Design a protein around this ligand. Structure first.
Ligand SMILES: CSCC[C@H](N)C(=O)OP(=O)(O)OC[C@H]1O[C@@H](n2cnc3c(N)ncnc32)[C@H](O)[C@@H]1O
Ligand SMILES: [Mg+2]
Ligand SMILES: [Zn+2]
Length: 530
């Protein structure tokens, strides 16, 4: 029996409201989850909120709100945001969950029993905003928001602070050779490749050990206690990273109460097929996480996808900078599925780029309306599809066969890209075929064939409708609502919208009735900017 397809988003710090960055990483995971459901597999995808630590506690304090009231309120903003974006998540975790906290304590004890924890002292730089320890070569003299010179993080630009503190330490230095061997033996363990190489270069340079506790006072008593030593709290990142494992073990009851299995095998999710993260948290997921998993004797992730940043004026859209627009209001201004298409199509995982209304509308107008939407209207037009059904095809021409060949070859290309994963190129391939379907429809001028050559019109519509079906099927993960509207317009049976048996030309039975579209009605309304 196949493993359940398991993918995760980062768990987001609840220091402020969700923005387009969290909607983006959560979308990637939702798309992958949805494609594997469409393919016919068992799927479990999760997201959630990272609620402990100094960064969050200080955010709460700033609002004059208890951290539990604050984390609950702000966590709810993430849950509601994702519901508004019509994601199909299986599980939404909070690190304040009693099941998770106990799990993290059990993991602590496993790492201790292994001999990988000792008591020591951290004396060095810390970035509170990133909850990150920084070595001497990862800080630079800079300036803060008030013009006062200071040290800053070379990771994030944030102000760093000097910490001298008794901390429990994890023996990360001891995993150097084991990490290097994993990276080299699993050449697609981290994507894109240049980030894999960055991780290798870093690990080859040498690792220091890592502080995995803080004194409880330093985190304002808002972290999981170290089991057996309540003077210390567990480092927010050790707690947070193991959310994925808690997720792998979680059963959700009828009344929403959650329980953990004692190990991962029965639920059959672990390890993740894909962890999706921003490059901001690469070291945590590519260096610390596999080392923790090695200590704990758990299987390592198949693949880490670490992507770039959506920017504004070339600066990362960031909760800590306040340069974020409301992502749901944006989705509602321009269309939810149109936004989803734009995020997935405009971006590759290597590059940063500014969110642009102009670029988003250009794709909505030029691809979604002018290609996909146009194609749907053509296939269902009462004056073209006179009988409002899938016609029987007659003999195929060489031109027909060439198009049909592209249809049959699409699934291979799209399935391969969805599994890399490379969602941008999946969409480019789907739209390549959609542009051909439209050029095919124009070349065959079906409005002229009507009541003139019924046989031929039958072949042209059948081929086009099948092509439209196949392309739409593979767009269901990115635009699930519009894809369903299209499938419904065509009268495509529910059983024919999903399953690998439907990955080839010639599925729908001629005679099948289409629902069609109403008079002035379009799938994608075009937008003009001021
Ligand atoms: C066990 S995981 C713990 C994670 C930790 N709690 C944390 O880092 O949480 P966080 O609230 O700072 O969210 C950071 C994440 O949100 C996305 N993201 C944020 N801004 C983005 C942007 N401008 N563009 C693209 N993606 C962005 C991207 O996925 C980035 O890695
Ligand atoms: Mg961040
Ligand atoms: Zn707690």
């Amino acid at each position: 029996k196949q493993k359940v397809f398991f993918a995760t988003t980062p768990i987001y710090y609840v220091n402020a409201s969700p923005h387009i960055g969290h909607v983006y990483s959560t979308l990637i995971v939702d798309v992958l989850g949805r494609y594997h459901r469409v393919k016919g597999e068992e799927v479990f995808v999760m997201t959630g909120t990272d609620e402990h630590g100094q960064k969050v506690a200080e955010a709460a304090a700033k609002q004059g709100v208890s951290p539990m009231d604050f984390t609950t309120s702000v966590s709810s903003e993430f849950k509601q945001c994702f519901q508004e974006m019509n994601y199909d998540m299986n599980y939404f975790i909070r690190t304040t969950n009693p099941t998770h906290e106990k799990l993290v304590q059990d993991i602590w004890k496993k790492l201790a029993a292994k001999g990988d924890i000792y008591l020591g002292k951290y004396e060095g730089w810390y970035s509170v905003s990133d909850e990150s320890f920084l070595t001497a070569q990862n800080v630079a003299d800079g300036v803060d928001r008030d013009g006062k010179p200071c040290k800053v993080s070379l990771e994030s630009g944030h102000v760093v602070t000097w910490v001298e503190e008794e901390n429990y330490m994890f023996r990360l230095s001891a995993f150097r050779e084991r990490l290097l061997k994993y990276f080299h033996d699993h050449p697609n363990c981290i994507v894109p490749e240049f980030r894999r190489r960055e991780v290798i270069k870093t690990v080859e340079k040498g690792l220091f050990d890592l502080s995995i506790s803080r004194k409880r006072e330093s985190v304002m008593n808002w972290s999981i206690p170290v089991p057996g030593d309540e003077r210390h709290c567990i480092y927010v990142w050790l707690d947070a990273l193991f959310n994925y494992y808690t997720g792998a073990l979680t059963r959700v009851a009828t009344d929403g109460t959650e329980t953990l299995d004692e190990d991962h095998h029965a639920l059959n999710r672990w390890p993740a097929d894909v962890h999706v993260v921003g490059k901001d948290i690469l070291k945590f997921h590519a260096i610390y996480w596999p080392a923790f998993l090695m200590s704990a004797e758990l299987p390592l992730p198949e693949r880490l996808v670490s992507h770039g940043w959506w920017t504004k004026d070339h600066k990362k859209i960031s909760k800590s900078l306040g340069n974020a627009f409301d992502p749901v209001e944006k989705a509602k201004e321009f269309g939810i599925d149109a936004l989803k298409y734009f995020l997935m199509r405009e971006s590759n995982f290597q590059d940063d780029g500014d969110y642009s209304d102009k670029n988003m509308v250009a794709r909505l107008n030029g691809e979604l309306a002018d290609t996909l939407g146009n194609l749907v209207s053509r296939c269902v037009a009462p004056k073209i599809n006179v009988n409002g059904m899938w016609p029987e095809p007659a003999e195929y021409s060489e031109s027909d066969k060439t198009l049909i060949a592209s249809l049959n070859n699409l699934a291979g290309t799209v399935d391969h890209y969805y599994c890399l994963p490379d969602i941008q190129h999946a969409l480019i391939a789907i739209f390549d075929v959609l542009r051909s379907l439209n050029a095919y429809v124009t070349e065959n001028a079906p409005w002229k064939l009507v009541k003139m050559d019924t046989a031929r019109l039958g072949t042209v519509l059948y081929v086009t409708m099948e092509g439209l079906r196949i392309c739409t099927m593979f767009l269901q993960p990115v635009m699930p609502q519009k894809a369903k509207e299209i499938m419904d317009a065509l009268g495509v049976p529910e059983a024919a919208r999903v399953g690998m048996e439907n990955y080839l030309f010639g599925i729908v039975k001629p005679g099948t009735k289409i629902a069609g579209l109403a008079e002035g009605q379009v799938v994608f309304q075009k937008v003009t900017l001021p």
